[PDB]
């Protein structure tokens, strides 16, 4: 079978969310579709944080199929952490169901992790990085032979650069579970193979980067999480410095600014930039690259590449988020494990 998840684009391409249904009877939530993590969680109805009072929460007491656990749940993301306990219940998405899906019932987070209209997150990466130790929903479906083709197809719609865009755009893209949507891409899919040691994040090697016509030293090539739940493109500090050195007038934001790790450059410079994956260059549009002015200096605009130094325990050195992914149709293939890119239709 196949099934489609309609995406809502939140925060001007900040996050892309889909509908999950949990429990009996079904309780529905908008959750961030996150190819850079592997746990499902939702805010629980007992959660007393402010964001919980302002969004939809999961009431464990009114699901007849909920199986409680005392087991702690906690997960750490780049943007903060989420804590609570594990539970097990029936979960549906895209017309599919996993009957005894283990997931987090979250009752605290760091400030501003999520808010209305979101209630949680669905991890789309591999079991080995699931904090819960549970098989991800998608991975159960792929493994069970339920899909026409063992892959997920992803289209993230762009609102950055639309000056009349809203903070909630319900026409935000699509994830097709069990195939690729041929109306959304043109030509052939270029698959970059993922070996059996790399099934954690969805990650592939960066072959090269070109910015303003200059090939950047990306030094030993980085493994890149292709991450639908990251807004921008996170790279090592030394690499970010090299990137912005290719744009005339670019500078690091000070730290006093509140924007340490970000870089700004002349707003009237259109930046030509591409990343090379699997022997092909994939351009990033200027509407994705230019984030606008972060300070009162309106002549300077922030770039989509930011400095983020990774733990030396991390198998990824780049996090390649929506800023990139908006420019390609993306296939996350279970078997043979691969990430594919195609030109958008």
């Amino acid at each position: 079978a196949t099934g489609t998840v309609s995406l809502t684009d939140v925060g001007l391409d900040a996050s892309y969310a889909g509908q999950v249904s949990i429990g009996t009877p079904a309780q529905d939530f908008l959750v961030i579709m996150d190819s850079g993590s592997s746990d499902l969680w939702v805010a629980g109805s007992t959660c007393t944080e402010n964001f919980c009072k302002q969004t939809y929460t999961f009431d464990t007491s009114t699901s007849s199929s909920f199986i409680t656990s005392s087991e702690a749940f906690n997960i750490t993301y780049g943007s903060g952490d989420a804590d609570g306990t594990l539970g097990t219940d029936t979960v549906s998405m895209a017309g599919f169901t996993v009957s005894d899906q283990t997931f987090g019932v979250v009752t605290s987070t760091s400030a501003n992790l999520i808010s209305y209209p979101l209630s949680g997150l669905m991890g789309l990466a591999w079991k080995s990085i699931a904090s819960s130790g549970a098989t991800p929903f998608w991975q159960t479906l792929a493994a069970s032979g339920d899909w026409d083709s063992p892959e997920m197809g992803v289209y993230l719609k762009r609102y950055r650069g639309d000056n009349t865009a809203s903070q909630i755009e319900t026409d935000g893209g699509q994830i097709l579970k069990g195939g690729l949507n041929t109306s959304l891409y043109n030509g052939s899919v270029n698959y970059i193979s993922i070996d059996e040691s790399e099934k954690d994040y969805w990650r592939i090697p960066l072959e090269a980067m070109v910015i303003q016509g200059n090939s950047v030293s990306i030094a030993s090539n980085p493994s890149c999480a292709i991450d639908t739940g990251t807004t921008l493109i996170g790279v090592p500090s030394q690499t970010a410095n090299r990137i912005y050195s290719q744009i005339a007038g670019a500078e690091a934001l000070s730290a006093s600014s509140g924007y340490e790790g970000y870089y700004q450059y002349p707003c009237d410079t259109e930046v030509t930039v591409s990343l090379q994956f699997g022997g092909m260059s994939y351009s990033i549009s200027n509407a994705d690259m230019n984030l606008g002015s972060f300070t009162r200096d309106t002549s300077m605009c922030t770039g989509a590449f930011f400095a983020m130094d990774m733990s030396s325990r991390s198998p990824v050195q780049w996090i390649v988020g929506a800023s990139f992914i908006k420019n390609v149709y993306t296939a996350f293939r279970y078997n043979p494990a691969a990430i594919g890119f195609a030109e958008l239709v």
């Binding site: 750490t76 993301y77 807004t231």
Partner: peptide, 6 residues
């Protein structure tokens, strides 16, 4: 921006 695990 957000940056989704560690």
């Amino acid at each position: 921006x957000v940056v989704x695990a560690x």
